[PDB]
Symmetry: C2
C-alpha cells in the first residue's frame, strides 16, 4: 500500500516569473560567476535574451511548489533527505521567462529498509513548451529513526511560514518539449575534445555562512544545514551542506570549464556521503571530471563529474550531457 498515491499530480495556480536580480542572487549563493548569469550583454553574446539561470536554480521554486506533496500527500515520514537529482535543461531558463510548475509523485521504491520517493516537476513557459524537467529523489525518515524530541527541536527552530485526501492524476495531453538546437553553444569545439580527457581539478570551499545564505536564498528551512546541535540530534556528525548546493557547485565547476551553462542538456547526480561543514574548518570540496563518450552526429558528449571531501566521495555517479561547438 506504499504505492497507492503514486501518480498523484497537481499544478500551482501561480506561475513563477524569473527575475534578473534573483538569478544573480542564486548564482552568488552557489559561487557561480559565469558571466552569462550576471551580465546581460555577455548572455546576449551567447545568444540569450536575458541573464541565464544557473542550472540548479529550479530547485528553489520547485521546493516551494512541492510543499503540499511532501507535507500532505506523502504520508508516513517526519522528514526527508535528498539522495539523487536529475536536471533536464530542455532550453536554458532566462530572466523574463514566466514558468508554470507542476508536481507528480512518480515512484516510491523500498530498497534495503529505506523508502526512496521520487517527485518530478516540470516548468512550462508562456508558449506552452516544457523548458525544464526536475526529478527529485529523497529518502523518507520515520519518527523512530531519529532521537526522541529531535522533531520537536526542528519544529521549534524552523522559520515562521503561513501556508480528506483525493487522488488526482496528470491529465491526458501531448508535451511540447522546448529545444535549443538553433543556438550555437559556447563550449569547446567537438573536434578539440576526446574521450578520456580529464578536467583540471577545482576546490570549492563552504563555510557555515554559505549554508546560512543558501538556506534563505533557496528557501530551504531544514535546520540540519545550520544548527550543529540539531544536526547531531538527527544522527549527523555535524552541520552538512544542502545536497542542492553541492550540485550547484558541481554545475558551476562544469560551466567554468565548458564556457556555457546553457549547453548542458542533462545533469544527473547521485549523492553519497554528506558534505560536513564544521564551524572550525568548513568544507573543502574537490571537483573533477572525465569525458566518457562523444557522439559526432550531434556533436554532443557525456562527462563524468566527481566530488570528494576529506577522503570521502560526496557524489556517486554524476554525469553532464553537453553540446559541443
Amino acid at each position: 500500500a506504499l504505492e497507492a498515491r503514486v501518480g498523484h499530480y497537481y499544478q500551482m495556480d501561480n506561475p513563477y516569473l524569473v527575475g534578473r536580480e534573483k538569478v544573480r542572487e542564486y548564482a552568488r549563493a552557489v559561487q557561480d560567476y559565469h558571466p552569462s548569469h550576471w551580465d546581460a550583454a555577455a548572455a546576449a553574446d551567447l545568444g540569450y535574451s536575458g541573464v541565464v539561470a544557473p542550472l540548479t536554480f529550479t530547485s528553489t521554486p520547485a521546493m516551494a511548489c512541492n510543499r503540499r506533496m511532501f507535507e500532505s500527500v506523502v504520508v508516513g515520514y517526519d522528514t526527508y533527505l535528498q539522495t539523487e537529482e536529475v536536471f533536464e535543461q530542455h532550453r536554458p531558463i532566462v530572466a523574463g521567462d514566466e514558468l508554470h510548475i507542476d508536481v507528480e509523485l512518480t515512484s516510491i521504491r523500498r530498497v534495503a529498509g529505506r523508502d526512496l520517493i521520487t517527485v518530478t516537476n516540470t516548468f512550462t513557459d508562456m508558449a506552452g513548451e516544457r523548458v525544464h524537467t526536475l526529478h527529485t529523489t529523497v529518502v523518507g525518515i520515520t519518527a523512530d529513526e531519529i532521537s526522541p524530541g529531535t522533531m520537536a527541536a526542528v519544529q521549534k527552530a524552523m522559520m515562521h511560514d503561513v501556508d480528506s485526501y483525493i487522488k488526482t492524476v496528470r491529465p491526458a495531453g501531448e508535451v511540447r518539449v522546448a529545444q535549443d538546437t538553433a543556438r550555437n553553444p559556447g563550449t569547446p569545439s567537438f573536434d578539440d575534445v576526446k574521450v578520456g580527457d580529464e578536467l583540471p581539478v577545482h576546490h570549492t570551499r563552504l563555510s557555515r555562512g554559505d549554508l546560512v545564505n543558501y538556506a534563505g536564498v533557496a528557501g530551504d528551512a531544514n535546520p540540519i544545514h545550520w544548527d550543529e546541535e540539531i544536526a547531531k540530534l538527527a544522527g549527523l556528525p555535524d552541520v552538512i551542506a544542502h545536497g542542492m548546493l553541492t550540485m550547484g557547485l558541481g554545475a558551476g565547476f562544469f560551466s567554468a570549464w565548458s564556457g556555457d551553462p546553457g549547453a548542458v542538456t542533462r545533469y544527473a547526480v547521485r549523492l553519497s556521503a554528506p558534505a560536513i561543514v564544521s564551524a572550525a574548518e568548513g568544507a573543502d570540496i574537490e571537483f573533477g571530471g572525465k569525458i566518457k563518450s562523444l557522439d559526432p552526429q550531434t556533436r554532443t558528449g557525456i562527462v563524468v563529474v566527481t566530488a570528494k571531501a576529506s577522503g570521502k566521495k560526496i557524489f556517486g555517479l554524476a554525469t553532464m550531457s553537453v553540446r559541443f561547438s
Copy 2:
C-alpha cells in the same frame, strides 16, 4: 580628522530591477502577508501597477551597494551594528520598477565614546524621480572592543563572496522627488481616527530559522544573527535578530492595522536593546502604537510605534507618518 571623508559619494553602475517573486520572498521573510505584497490584483485594486515592495525591502539592495562605503571608504572599524534607520517612501516601489542607487556618507558623530556613522541611499526610477531615501545609522566597533580572535572567527564563518583613496562628492543638480498624491490611500478615513487612539497589540515570534532565512534573503552575512558562539564572543547575550528584520516586522504590524503599506510616507526607528533569539525560546516581540498627531489639511498623521520583548524596549522612539483616506 574623523570628518575628512564625510560627503563621499558614489553611484552603482547597475540598476536594480524589482522582481515580483523577490518581493513576495522578502514579504515572507518579514512575516508580512498584506495582500498588496503578494497578489497583483489586490495591489491593482489599491492603485498599484504590480505587487508593492514591503517598506524595508530597500535594505536589501542598499546593503549590497554600501559594501564599498563600509569596507573601503570608512576606515577604523572592524564591524558595525545598526542603531537607527529612516525610510522615506516618496512613492511605493512596485515590481517592475528599475532603480538606480547611490550612496553618500552623510555624517560621523562621536557621542559618549561611540562613533555614529550615517550613510544615505537614494533610489531613482527610470524617469529620473527619487522614489525612496534610506538613512542608515550604525555604530562603528573597533578591534579592541570585542574579544581577541572574534574577528577571525567571524571571517571564517562568513559566506564566500567575490567582490589610494580619492574623495568624490555628489554632483550638483536638482532632485525630482516622486509623489503619490494622485493615488487614494487604502487606510482608515481621517474622520474615523483621533489623536490618542491606541493600536491593538500584536505579538510576532522569531525563531533561529527566521533569522537564518532573513540572512540569505536580505544578503546580511553577519554571523551574530545565526551563530551563538560568535554572538557571545562579540559580547552579546545570545544570537540577536537583525535590526532591519525587526523594523520590517514593525512595518508589517502597521500595515495590518492601516490597510495600505504604500500609504506610509516616512518610517523612523531608533533601536534600543537587541532582540535576543535563543535556541530554546526564540523571541516574542510585542508591537503597539498610538496616534500622536493629525493634520486635517493634508489628512495625514503621525503614529508612534512601540516594540518590546521580555521586559525591554526593542525600539526607542519610532514613528510612522501616514496618509489617511
